[PDB]
Design a protein around this ligand. Structure first.
Ligand SMILES: [Zn+2]
Length: 27
């Protein structure tokens, strides 16, 4: 939906999911 952090705001939870996935992707 809306991300306060990195200026991101999409109406698709996949986007955030990708953010968390990629962000959490790194050790
Ligand atoms: Zn963010």
């Amino acid at each position: 939906y809306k991300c306060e952090h990195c200026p991101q705001a999409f109406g698709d939870e996949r986007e955030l999911q990708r953010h968390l996935d990629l962000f959490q992707g790194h050790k």
